[PDB]
């Protein structure tokens, strides 16, 4: 992740928000573990949403609302909103950091395909992976095996 932006700030706030604090014992906003598998499984559709221009925010909100459409998900609207905001910020940072770099790497006919592929970073996919890894870290800290 790049610390020169709001994605790092939002990532820190999300971690602090959804990590259980045992030292206290009043409460923290609850966590939905099914969002972790949704991010992994629906990654291609999320990439399609992210690559959409000037409609990605509404599309992301609609996707998360329409996938988590049950009465039990009324409590996790804050988590869904935070995930959407962080994902959009990370996609913007990744395109602004990597689009020109990738398009100059792609047509640099000195490197073979293997090193080009190891050098070419997909912005939307990297943002999805970052959000997924952050959610997995939250779950790993939160989950105990009593």
């Amino acid at each position: 992740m790049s610390k020169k932006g709001k994605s790092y700030v939002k990532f820190n706030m999300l971690l602090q928000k959804y990590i259980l604090k045992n030292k206290d014992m009043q409460e923290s906003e609850k966590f939905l573990s099914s969002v972790i598998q949704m991010i992994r499984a629906h990654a291609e559709i999320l990439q399609i949403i992210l690559q959409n221009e000037d409609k990605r925010t509404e599309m992301l909100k609609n996707y998360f609302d329409n996938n988590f459409n049950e009465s039990c998900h009324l409590g996790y609207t804050g988590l869904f909103e935070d995930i959407q905001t962080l994902l959009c910020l990370r996609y913007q940072e990744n395109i602004q950091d990597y689009q020109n770099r990738n398009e100059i790497i792609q047509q640099n006919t000195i490197l073979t395909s293997d090193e080009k592929e190891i050098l070419i970073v997909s912005p939307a996919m990297d943002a999805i992976h970052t959000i997924f890894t952050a959610l997995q870290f939250i779950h790993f800290i939160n989950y105990n095996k009593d």
């Binding site: 499984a41 629906h42 291609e44 559709i45 990439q47 399609i48 949403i49 409609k55 509404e58 599309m59 609609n62 996707y63 329409n66 996938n67």
Partner: protein, 136 residues
């Protein structure tokens, strides 16, 4: 099975072209039930009767239910395009004419489960792509 990104892209294009999604990214809220019921009906009653039922235009339905068959046709045409052409390929790749209705097309060219498989994948793609929009 996983989600085919290309089929979802075809679903997006077909949903926009067949006038299910309005300009402010919205649909009349009966179409999600239409797609889910189409999948269930294809499983439970067979391809031809389900296609005839959902392709009928003289229906007392809330909205234009026959548009989902147009979306199905567009998705199937798009995926039959970019089918690889090798002499070992079981796929037809012939494009369904816009003159033809889906039911007559399956009637006169229907001897293989290729259409059933393509329709199942197209219905799944429609279901997953419609979740990206809002219901009026």
């Amino acid at each position: 099975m996983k989600i085919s990104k290309k089929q979802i892209e075809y679903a997006i294009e077909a949903l926009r072209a067949n006038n299910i999604i309005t300009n402010d990214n919205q649909y009349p809220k009966v179409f999600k039930g239409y797609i889910s019921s189409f999948g269930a009906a294809v499983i439970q009653s067979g391809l031809i009767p389900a296609i005839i039922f959902f392709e009928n235009e003289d229906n007392d339905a809330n909205a234009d239910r026959h548009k989902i068959i147009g979306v199905l046709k567009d998705i199937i045409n798009a995926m039959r395009q970019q089918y690889t052409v090798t002499d070992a390929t079981i796929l037809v790749s012939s494009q369904i004419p816009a003159n033809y209705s889906m039911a007559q097309y399956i009637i006169e060219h229907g001897n293989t489960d290729q259409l059933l498989k393509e329709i199942t994948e197209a219905a799944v793609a429609m279901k997953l792509a419609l979740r990206m929009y809002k219901s009026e």
